[PDB]
């Protein structure tokens, strides 16, 4: 065998490509969008439905939806579009030579895996496959066998905690908040400048403003007391039609969410203290080594500063006799790619897949008893 | 003090009165109207602008505009002018012996409550004020402390999920779809017939024909085949030229875009879907209370057979083992000025106005943390 | 000042007098005549042209023109001797003291206002001076601000819908069919009876013979089936030699021209199509005042009859749920006059002339930007 | 199949043809003529109508009349007789063999294509038949599948947005101003100088006028106060009988009816308003490619200087950050005709047509459910 495919099928992007390489070839938004409109000029190259970047680029005639929502998979029909898109037109392989690694966030329905296994088989007839939890693959994608991880991508939060290789399934906290429902909580608090955006369009309008113009204040009620001279916080957003808009408080203010919750509504506890919560439901004698390796990872963890305010607010929670430290890196909105593309290349992982002949003799439940 | 104003500034019309009464001495159209004319005798009562009553009486000659637009005071200069025939012209009282009570809807942008806060302490000098939230009012109406109410009126259409006494504002839903928007789309389908209504002048002439010949069909589908064989689902209408009107279909196909706004091309769901959209974003203890207690409010609720389809619409969304109680009071064109009449006359609501003293040394800031 | 000059200068007539009085002190044709023959007893008060009685009463050896032709002024050189048989002879003012008021009609060219204003100012020196059109103070005459006016006079027939005092000019009808071509027709249907009236002198004779013995028949087919029992319907005039002359079916066929005016050979419509036509020009809000105030003037709308088939054809066009008043005066030979004598007595009009100071500094493109 | 028929029924023009050709083979107004005149010489060819071009050579005896007018058939006895005159006397082809192409404005009643349906099958027996919309055909015709079109004909202008190849019906901006109301009003304002224009003859000598002394001022109080010296913006016509007029501002007055229609008395847009609100009503992402690609269509685009005041002035609303390209094409008096050239030629459209035998099972109801 040459290579294996690595699919990492986020809830906001495709990341896909090949076991071994530092970068995946295919990163696409996880779109499906059908028209809406009448249409006219019947022919020349109108398609039915439209998947990923053609998706993207065509936006505003069509209605796009997301086939995975808050990490499960509620769309059957149209994710099978995906990866027909990912593997035929991103990648252009056929999947009946390459074995595939997919991956899943941790305490995930069971339906979603026994039917990510059973379309890979039936659908692309794959040599082999595997489905991993996205948060150990970000850890060792990191260089380590020790640490909790917050991966936080765009459709859920999760926390899993690792020591030297062994995860503790009874500490993983996940929650459903995440980058689409902060993209959704500035939707709401761009209407009080008289911003109206509301179709799903505008959806994606919204979520280009909260990558480049949103921040993690280090003390939030300091900044919003700075806001009140509403001079230095305000900057300006370039909209597609032309238009110029000036968003001041809202800008740290939706990833204020990631810690106080119930600003969208949630009885719930923020990213730090359900990582502070995590840790404490582990034994005392590996917290010294959790405290220690706080791994991020995720889109949602690319915010300017929240590294920052994940240090300053652990170490309130923690007893103050011991250091916290806070793992940022550069790449970590691929890390889950990049540890599913190392994991793919090793020789003692060449056993561990689950083949063809394992599945026809053993149906859909040979998928739960080969991971944790 | 003897008494306090509620005036109930909607897109449409304007509800004015005292608390303590069960109906608005002053309804009147939002309408400031110019002349666009050349105006050769110059006297004999020519004024600038008119406004309301008078700019309906006169409106063949005039530009009739609306300063509220989608619940937005747009035009301030001319937001003015109707608050001036509120107080003298409609009520003949001075604003600096009554306090004032102000609505609006939610959602709404905050330089809107900041400049009705201005305008009525620096232009009016109100002793004190307070501006509400319309839906909340409506469910205060009609003697509940417990339901979703939908508010639809001539600008905005929006849901405000409230359990005993406590507003859930993550569930609200707004919608700029409203009678408005049902007006300009009865005028899109008029042309179909060969009647041409293009100048805001027939915008009340098509107006008055959707308020006495417009129904909500049961089933859609089957009375579009139903009016195939049209006889019997035609009526004639008087306009004021004294031609006559004959409309077919068209009666109940502008109040379906209330239920299917892909008519007039808006990517967003029914007021049914957003009905039961606001109640599956509740806590899940709640929705038994909700589901039964589903009050409607507005004029744009007033079409005949809207609570039927209402009810049959949503419970084919909600499971079927509970029941569904659309509340329709016949009052409920005035139940938003009804709910703030009773809220101006408590003696526990008393000590919640927002006094002149206030307002000079905390500026327009102290409207926003008053309300929710 | 005490009192201020209203010349109306018509095509037929001329009116003339002062502010505040109820009937015109000066009624004469608007004649020039040159005698076309010999004159062999030179002296004895022979003048070089004759103006206005005068003319008229030597009209067997003059040459009658007339300067105003359809509502415009053709032949300024005679224009001047009425305007100084008027102020001189007829009146016996002084034009320096009393500022005048002269009229024209709509949709008239600029060169014929821009020279009533140079001669009043350069010639007779007037202090101050206006031009109304003639059908706006026909309706301002009838104590009304509301109603289409069918000004049909000597020259020009045209429509004016005014409604609350604001003119309407994109819906004014002009029809150049008037009183005089009514002469020309009757001349041209004298002439199957064997009565040769060919001259300019024997135009007022025919002229004579209109104004007491035509009148306008309620069915037209039916009286000219009523005619062709010739007895009743005929009756003899007096001509100035001593001749009787006897006209039949003659009587009521030249007023057709008013209601058909293809017998003149016109692409026209006719009096009551051109104010049906200009009604449905206006907005459809104000057509409900507009067919309920029809005021006639003119010398033209004098027939006997002429009211009674304008308000049964109209009828026939308007739709028959509402009402069709024509507003006849029995003064509506001068009410064109006596609006202006009223207008000219007001105080809120003092202001609106157009006085020395500012011609001179302006130029004759002044009294454009003042009316319309 | 050999070929096609393209007939684009204009309010002004007839253009037709066949499938495949660059320009029509048959240009002729859409004009029945009737003689109103006695008619002495019985015999020798007088017809008693008179259809297109053989009554715009016998103009001065008839009475022209429009069938279409504002792009709504009111004449349909008379509208066969152009079809007539068109295949048998234009072409000289027989409809028996030629499915035929026929063209409507959007937001037209739907009597209107029902009519064209039912004579093209019935009188004329097509095999098959077509009726498309003018704005979509001519984008086609420029090659493109993105831009807004404006296609400001002789009886309506209305703009139509397609975004590649979907069309947005809710934004359909239809105005019944067009070529026609701009020479009635031309006909108006030669009155000033005195120039009497009155029958339906003359209608189209002013419009011969307009055709060729009439440009777009880039701005219109700036070229007011040149005209002031009334030396160079001054051209001389030859009317037919000789005579000589000298128009002045009334040259590109009457086209700034088209951006002010205020002139006419119409409370509404110009066309750079309404191609602005046109815009503003699609969503927020495909702006971009609808201010870039603004294809203008119609003979009254045809003005000098039409192309460049429409990029000046929609620059004045749109944001200033971005390109505003008006697309005029040299061929665009029969980019309607051109469009449907190509389009009845294609062979992806050769399935789309409507057949005799779904026709005469469905009723005349099939024509609406093939559109859009
Ligand atoms: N550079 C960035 N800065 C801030 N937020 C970002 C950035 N990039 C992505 N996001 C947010 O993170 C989400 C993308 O996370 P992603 O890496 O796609 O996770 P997954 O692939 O598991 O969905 C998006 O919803 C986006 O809003
Ligand atoms: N009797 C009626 N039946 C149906 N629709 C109505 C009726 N009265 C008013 N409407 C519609 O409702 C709107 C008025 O709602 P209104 O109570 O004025 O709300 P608001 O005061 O918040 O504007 C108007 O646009 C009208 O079209
Ligand atoms: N009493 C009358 N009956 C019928 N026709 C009349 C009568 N008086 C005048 N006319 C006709 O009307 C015309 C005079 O109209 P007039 O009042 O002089 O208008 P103007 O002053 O604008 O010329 C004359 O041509 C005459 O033929
Ligand atoms: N060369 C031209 N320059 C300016 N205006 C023109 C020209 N040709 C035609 N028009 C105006 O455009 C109208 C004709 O438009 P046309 O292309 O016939 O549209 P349609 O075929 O849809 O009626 C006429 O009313 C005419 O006044
Ligand atoms: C289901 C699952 O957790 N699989 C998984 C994830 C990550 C990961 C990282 C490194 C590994 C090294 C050796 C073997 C395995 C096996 C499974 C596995 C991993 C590894
Ligand atoms: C801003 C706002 O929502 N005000 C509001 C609305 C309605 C309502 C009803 C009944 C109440 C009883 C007691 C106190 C208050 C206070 C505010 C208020 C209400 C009431
Ligand atoms: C040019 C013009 O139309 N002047 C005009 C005509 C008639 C009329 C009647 C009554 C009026 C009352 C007040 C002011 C004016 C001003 C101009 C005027 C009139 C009047
Ligand atoms: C009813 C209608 O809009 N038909 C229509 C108009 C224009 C147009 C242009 C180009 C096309 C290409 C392929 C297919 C079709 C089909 C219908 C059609 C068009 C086209
Ligand atoms: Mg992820
Ligand atoms: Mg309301
Ligand atoms: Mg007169
Ligand atoms: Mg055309």
């Known amino acids: 065998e040459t290579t294996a495919l690595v699919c990492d099928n986020g809830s906001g992007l495709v990341k896909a490509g090949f076991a071994g390489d530092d970068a995946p070839r ?18 020349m190259g109108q398609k039915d439905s439209y998947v990923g970047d053609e998706a993207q680029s065509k936006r505003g005639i069509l209605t796009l939806k997301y086939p995975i929502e808050h990490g499960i998979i509620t769309n059957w029909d149209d994710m099978e579009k995906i990866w027909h898109h990912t593997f035929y037109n991103e990648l252009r392989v056929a999947p009946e030579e390459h074995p595939t690694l997919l991956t899943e966030a941790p305490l995930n329905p069971k339906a979603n895996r026994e039917k990510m296994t059973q379309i890979m088989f039936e659908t692309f007839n794959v040599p082999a496959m595997y489905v991993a939890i996205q948060a150990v693959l970000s850890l060792y994608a990191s260089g380590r066998t020790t640490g909790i991880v917050l991966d936080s991508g765009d459709g859920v939060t999760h926390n899993v905690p690792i020591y030297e290789g062994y995860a503790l399934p009874h500490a993983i906290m996940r929650l459903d908040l995440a980058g689409r429902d902060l993209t959704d909580y500035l939707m709401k608090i761009l209407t009080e400048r008289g911003y109206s955006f509301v179709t799903t369009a505008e959806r994606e309008i919204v979520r280009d403003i909260k990558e480049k113009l949103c921040y993690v204040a280090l003390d939030f009620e300091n900044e919003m007391a700075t806001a009140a001279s509403s001079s230095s916080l305000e900057k300006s957003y370039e909209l597609p039609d032309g238009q110029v808009i000036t968003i001041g408080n809202e800008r740290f203010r939706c990833p204020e969410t990631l810690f106080q919750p119930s600003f969208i509504g949630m009885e719930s506890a923020g990213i730090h203290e359900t990582t502070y919560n995590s840790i404490m439901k582990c034994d005392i004698d590996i917290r010294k080594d959790l405290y220690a390796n706080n791994v991020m990872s995720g889109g949602t963890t690319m915010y300017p500063g929240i590294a920052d305010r994940m240090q300053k607010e652990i170490t309130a929670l923690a007893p103050s006799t011991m250091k916290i430290k806070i793992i940022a890196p550069p790449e970590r909105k691929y890390s889950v790619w990049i540890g599913g593309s190392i994991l793919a290349s090793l020789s003692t992982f060449q056993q561990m897949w689950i083949t063809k002949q394992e599945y026809d003799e053993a149906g859909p439940s040979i998928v739960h008893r080969k991971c944790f």
Do not use: C, D, E, W
């Open 26 to 43: 295919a990163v696409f938004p996880s779109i499906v969008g059908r028209p809406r409109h009448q249409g006219v000029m019947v022919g």
